[PDB]
Amino acid sequence: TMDEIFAAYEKRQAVLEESSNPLSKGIAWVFGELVPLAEARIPLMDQGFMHSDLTYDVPSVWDGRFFRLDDHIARLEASCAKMRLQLPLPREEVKQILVDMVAKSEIKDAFVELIVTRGLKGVRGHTPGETFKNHLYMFVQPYVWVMDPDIQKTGGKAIIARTVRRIPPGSIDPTVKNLQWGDLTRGLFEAADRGATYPFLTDGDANLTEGSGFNVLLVKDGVIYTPDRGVLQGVTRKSCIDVAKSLGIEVRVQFVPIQMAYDADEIFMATTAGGIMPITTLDDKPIQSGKVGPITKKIWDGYWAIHYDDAYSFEIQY
């Protein structure tokens, strides 16, 4: 369970922390060249920095196993299509370069990110009939924890953000994974100001959405609820629905009034970085007993169980 998975990770991290490979700290792919992540440089005029005109996606590899890589690359392709972007490399070649980068980095628990930007020329002065010269950036990095393992044992502190709302879909489509974190960064600052660690943003219409890079799932009377609109369709949320269906628990991706967060039995977040992240304190008050809930634990175990299932992952050779 939690102790077993975390213990094995801390052993793997000890091996990585005393490695001599300079790429063990990170590796990046820029225009066909592999460089240490610290030595990664992009053009200043790239429209992915100029106007954040890009999409991105983050797969993960745990214990040397890429977790649901097909799903993330498929979502990256869908996001590119929605923003009139093209994946600059074939999907299978992108997969192969990712395994090669991870293999050279020797990292077994890694944070992997792919970024597809508009290029050096913007959309303002664009002659119709031409397409854009989109750019591709990729890098591998040690596994990032939105919630540390020790905190996952006891649950974290969350607030319902009052000073900031989620960017509506009519402005930016949340189903397109974007790096425009204006509202999310504001939510993080508010959470820090209010003695918490995780912000939950409202839909602006008294509905729940998501937080600073994670989906929110409520548990109430044996049924799981998660917001449908205004949110990114997370892969970890997709894994939660898969695990729950195998456990006989049904998840309802529907409109969630914000009051349900205060009346819920359990609350937990989901993202590729932290994984399953239970929340035990809401608005400086414990959820129920102040401890991680039962349904949260079953989903936690199932999520990390399918990390070793060949149907959801494949092994990397070092």
Ligand X SMILES: *Cc1c(COP(=O)(O)O)cnc(C)c1O
Q: Which residues are annotated as a binding site for pyridoxal 5'-phosphate?
A: 56, 75, 235-236, 272
- Residue 292 interacts, among ligand X, a copy of itself, none and using kind-specific CB cut-offs from 5 to 8 Å, with none
Residues that bind a copy of itself (CB under 8 A): 28, 30, 37-38, 40-46, 48-53, 83-84, 123-126, 128, 137, 139, 144-146, 164-168, 170-172, 178-186, 188-189, 192-193, 204, 212-213
Q: Which of 68, 117, 89, 38 is nearest to 304 (CA)?
A: 68
- Residue 236 interacts, among ligand X, a copy of itself, none and using kind-specific CB cut-offs from 5 to 8 Å, with ligand X
Q: Which of 211, 208, 166, 217 is nearest to 188 (CA)?
A: 211
Report, in Å, the least distance between residue 76 CB and ligand X. Answer: 10
Report, in Å, the least distance between residue 306 CB and a copy of itself. Answer: 26
Return the number of the residue (168 or 257) whose C-beta is nearest a copy of itself: 168
- Residue 52 interacts, among ligand X, a copy of itself, none and using kind-specific CB cut-offs from 5 to 8 Å, with a copy of itself
Given a contact cutoff of 8 angstroms between Cβ atoms, the answer to whether 185 and 201 are in contact is no
Residues that bind ligand X (CB under 6 A): 58, 177, 210, 213-215, 232, 234-237, 270-272
Rg (CA), the chain: 20
In whole angstroms, what is the distance from residue 244 CA to residue 224 CA?
9
Return the number of the residue (210 or 266) whose C-beta is nearest ligand X: 210
Return the number of the residue (79 or 134) whose C-beta is nearest ligand X: 79
Return the number of the residue (135 or 177) whose C-beta is nearest ligand X: 177
- Residue 214 interacts, among a copy of itself, ligand X, none and using kind-specific CB cut-offs from 5 to 8 Å, with ligand X
Quote the DSSP letter at residue 302.
H
The amino acid that residue 208 corresponds to is L
Return the number of the residue (69 or 282) whose C-beta is nearest ligand X: 69
Given a contact cutoff of 8 angstroms between Cβ atoms, the answer to whether 93 and 87 are in contact is no
Given a contact cutoff of 8 angstroms between Cβ atoms, the answer to whether 73 and 91 are in contact is yes
Return the number of the residue (34 or 140) whose C-beta is nearest ligand X: 140
- Residue 13 interacts, among a copy of itself, ligand X, none and using kind-specific CB cut-offs from 5 to 8 Å, with none
Report, in Å, the least distance between residue 101 CB and a copy of itself. Answer: 14
Integer angstrom CA distances of residue 224 from 216, 240, 301: 10, 10, 16
Given a contact cutoff of 8 angstroms between Cβ atoms, the answer to whether 280 and 286 are in contact is yes
Specify the 3-state DSSP secondary structure of 252.
strand
Q: Which of 60, 61, 118, 58 is nearest to 86 (CA)?
A: 118
Dmax over Cα atoms in the chain, in whole Å? 61
Report, in Å, the least distance between residue 125 CB and ligand X. Answer: 15
- Residue 2 interacts, among a copy of itself, ligand X, none and using kind-specific CB cut-offs from 5 to 8 Å, with none
In whole angstroms, what is the distance from residue 134 CA to residue 164 CA?
33
